[PDB]
Amino acid sequence: EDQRNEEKAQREANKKIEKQLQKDKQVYRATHRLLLLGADNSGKSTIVKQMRGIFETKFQVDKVNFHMFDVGGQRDERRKWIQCFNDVTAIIFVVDSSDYNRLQEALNLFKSIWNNRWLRTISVILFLNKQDLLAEKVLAGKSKIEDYFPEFARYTTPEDATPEPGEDPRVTRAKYFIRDEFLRISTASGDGRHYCYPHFTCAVDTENARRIFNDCRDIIQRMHLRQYELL
Amino acid sequence: QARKLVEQLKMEANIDRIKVSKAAADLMAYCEAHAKEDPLLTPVPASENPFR
Amino acid sequence: GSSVYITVELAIAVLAILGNVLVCWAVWLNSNLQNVTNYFVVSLAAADIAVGVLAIPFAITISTGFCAACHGCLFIACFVLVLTQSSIFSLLAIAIDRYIAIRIPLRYNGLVTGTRAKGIIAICWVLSFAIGLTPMLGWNNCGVACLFEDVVPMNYMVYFNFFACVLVPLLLMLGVYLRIFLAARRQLKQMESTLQKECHAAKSLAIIVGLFALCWLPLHIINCFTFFCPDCSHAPLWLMYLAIVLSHTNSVVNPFIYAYAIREFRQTFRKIIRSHVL
Amino acid sequence: QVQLQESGGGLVQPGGSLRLSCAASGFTFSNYKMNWVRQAPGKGLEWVSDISQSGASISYTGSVKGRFTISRDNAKNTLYLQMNSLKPEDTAVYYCARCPAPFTRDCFDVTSTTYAYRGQGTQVTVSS
Amino acid sequence: DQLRQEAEQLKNQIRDARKACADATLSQITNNIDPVGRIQMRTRRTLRGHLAKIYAMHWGTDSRLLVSASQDGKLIIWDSYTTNKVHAIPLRSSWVMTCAYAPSGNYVACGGLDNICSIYNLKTREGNVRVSRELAGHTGYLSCCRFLDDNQIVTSSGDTTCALWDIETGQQTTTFTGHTGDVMSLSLAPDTRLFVSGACDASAKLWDVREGMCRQTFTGHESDINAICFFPNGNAFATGSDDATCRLFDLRADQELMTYSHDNIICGITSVSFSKSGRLLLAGYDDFNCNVWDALKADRAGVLAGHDNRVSCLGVTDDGMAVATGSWDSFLKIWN
Ligand SMILES: Nc1ncnc2c1ncn2[C@@H]1O[C@H](CO)[C@@H](O)[C@H]1O
């Protein structure tokens, strides 16, 4: 034979590769991956101050690693490369609440993402951004939301609302109508495999990291409980 | 604008063609000829099969 | 004048093995069932198979009361104790794993590794061996017949085995599953009727503790009663038989409450029989 | 092979009525979700309405709710859109779009002059 | 606006010419052939070591080695005969969609959402595998790049365009334009003189690498095309689309020959490959199953079950002795 050296070298190389792969697996499993979505001019690039598949980001809260991605160098069509994110911890959706013209487009995109086959088991963190601008528009009172959403004329603020102190009833009503517009689609189906976590954000906010942390913790806990059939 | 598309269609149309009967006959002849040299179609002895 | 004891334990052993091997088979076949979460389930199934295959015949021998040497039949008693404690410690390990998963959801993956799970299982088995084999060293009651109660000190049983391998694990399981229920109901109250679903979760969590307690309490209660009340009448023989079979029924009930509860396990079980029975 | 040709459209006075048709061929009509989209001058594509495979579920944008109706016929492979009380802001080219895949409920078909399962479009003008 | 009438007239003329050329049907002409039988392929090897879904794989010309890519950002070179990890290359970007193996066995390539087909040298003098050349210039995601020789690599991107590169200078040499949707796959001819592509517009095109202009276009599908393969004799090809159907097209006849579909299948096809003799067609579906089709009779010869998640890639060796299938469950299986 005199050819046992080949097998010895191959086995040694495989052993070294596996030794490295073990650490690789540890690191890969210790980290959570998030997908960042949203239309242009929405604060998507500045939701998280970052002071800690094209655009990457890394941040830590309570020594828990996170990884966020932004596919911002593709064409408008997204029905193919979206499938490559079917195993992310959560999807972060950023929507400009003060753009009544693009609100319908944002809603349609959200509905498509929610109802997609390969994304049927992903929870969405919904960041409703530009609240100061929405409040300014509502207070100015030159453009009526009922022009684009006729049902707004018969909508009343929810009893469970928690208006921030000093916020006008008009602005609170408009804000919660916008939130309920997404929540209706979110609850319209899903079978309990995923949920939405609406939030009210501002351009000068800095708490977004903690909010994402809490939402991810809740998502994972619910996943485990459903696995054990508790929920 | 659409002139490129029109020229492409014209060039594509200006091409020879063969009968579908002849095409299928050629495909069948190739398949029949290369029949005994296809391990997946006709199995092979375990002696000559490296199990991979 | 005849013993139905033997036939009942033959049935129990057959049921345990044929039904615990199924869990291992399902884990082997399915690829998405191979996880550190199922490591502990497979360890518990292996312990149940071991007890059902060894302790039950050993219990039969210890009951027959055949003639043998003192310092003998202690091996059988201690092999029964070890194989029984292995399952209890595996259950406690499963409970601890579930508690960790539900209390630190974010760091669970980084905390529970395959090597750490293997170490945990090894520690469980080593502790089971140490506790079970203790009487052979310096606490045996041979200062004959294989009969158990004459070989194994009942004082040792009551003082050590119960209070350190049934009570403490039982209380830990109670606390763990109470915290799990609290977390589940808090998460359900977040608009995840509430009363129906909350009650369903409560019932599901309490089929575990209830079945464990039913299987394992009566025998130790009898042991404690005998130890602390020697003057009063000793328990009937048939009661001891019933308590023993109840204790051994844990090995057969475990797969239905730990493996059959998972949807993936349920799906894989159907495929196995539907394919290999036909 | 896949083709969508839209009929109807033209000139009309404010508050009038109109009907559009979109005859399709090259695919199994009954297995797909159909939509109507429009592009007003100087603006991007905007989704108007859609209908399900069986015609059970229907959706309209807020701007046109109560005035437009979308109808579907599977025995003839025709898609309709009845436009009523149409306002001057409805001037645009109305395309007839099919969703990319069958037996699903989700679509990404407002791409900038890129979607391949969208028709040529028919002009609709409302004015004096 | 007048050009639309001319385009419609040309399309009608082409359709009429094809209808005239349609003398008979392949199903009719192959009616009297004895059926292939029943294929009972069984798994021979299982390759473990990937952490995430496997997106692509490719066989070496030696019929023993192969490469694969996964979402964790690793390329692994396998030795199928004796399961062993020859190499494990960590990629800069973890979103990789394709892999390639050079015919000479000296280089491998991969790319993805980074819009680059990177090239790695497997025969470095130092002994450590490192990236050699990075190709930039594509706008959309990179869905396929396949080696032509040690210096030329063909590429397809999601921006509706293919390209021919010069690895030495890293400069595009030819650009193939005309597709309306994202190009999803391509297949080289054995004579390495042409290649076909399939895009997200239910159409496929025949290209001439030396010239750089489309020669023919084929349209018989209803939805996007995900896979494409070339017949062994280089006179036909097969495709798989989202309409749960595969079709066979002939270059010389310029039409689809036969359609492989079953009413029980409503899932898209993710991969297609041909056996060495060209008689069996192997297709992967989203239902975690791969079917084997009698390419001459459109009869299901057999099935390849035993994958948990969606099956994503397929391959048959140059010597045609085995079939490799990867899937989203992160396992590769070799079938006799
Ligand atoms: N007092 C006892 N009499 C008989 N068997 C016993 C007794 N205590 C324990 N065992 C056996 O040992 C196991 C655990 O100690 C029990 O499940 C039973 O099989």
Side-chain angles (χ1 to χ4, degrees), chain C residues 5 9 55 59 62 77 80-81 84-85 148 152 154 157 161 215-216 219-220 222-223 226 240 243-248:
Chain C
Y5 188 124
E9 302 218 14
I62 220 67
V80 168
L81 265 46
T84 48
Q85 292 341 296
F148 187 81
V152 152
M154 205 81 62
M157 278 286 240
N161 195 53
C215 278
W216 266 115
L219 197 79
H220 292 257
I222 284 162
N223 285 344
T226 54
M240 225 79 75
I244 291 158
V245 297
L246 262 193
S247 154
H248 290 149

Side-chain angles (χ1 to χ4, degrees), chain D residues 2 26-28 31-32 98 100-103 115-117, chain E residues 180-181 199-202 219-225 242-243 266:
Chain D
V2 170
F27 58 89
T28 321
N31 304 136
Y32 288 101
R98 161 173 91 66
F103 308 131
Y115 197 54
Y117 312 115
Chain E
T180 320
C200 291
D201 56 39
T219 64
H221 269 130
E222 307 176 4
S223 199
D224 316 348
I225 294 158
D242 275 328
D243 51 330
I266 53 140

Side-chain angles (χ1 to χ4, degrees), chain E residues 41 43-52 54-63 65-70 72-98 100-117:
Chain E
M41 275 137 84
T43 308
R44 306 284 148 184
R45 302 257 190 291
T46 307
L47 318 173
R48 318 174 153 79
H50 274 307
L51 318 182
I54 284 158
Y55 286 117
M57 57 81 64
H58 201 213
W59 276 103
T61 54
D62 83 328
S63 311
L65 297 147
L66 72 144
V67 69
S68 86
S70 68
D72 53 27
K74 288 284 231 301
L75 285 173
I76 297 174
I77 309 283
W78 304 89
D79 191 312
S80 58
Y81 281 4
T82 85
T83 310
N84 280 323
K85 282 124 174 152
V86 188
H87 293 103
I89 306 146
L91 320 179
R92 294 252 303 286
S93 181
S94 70
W95 310 104
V96 55
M97 291 170 84
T98 55
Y101 214 145
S104 69
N106 308 136
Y107 301 97
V108 289
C110 72
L113 297 174
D114 50 331
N115 300 342
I116 295 158
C117 188

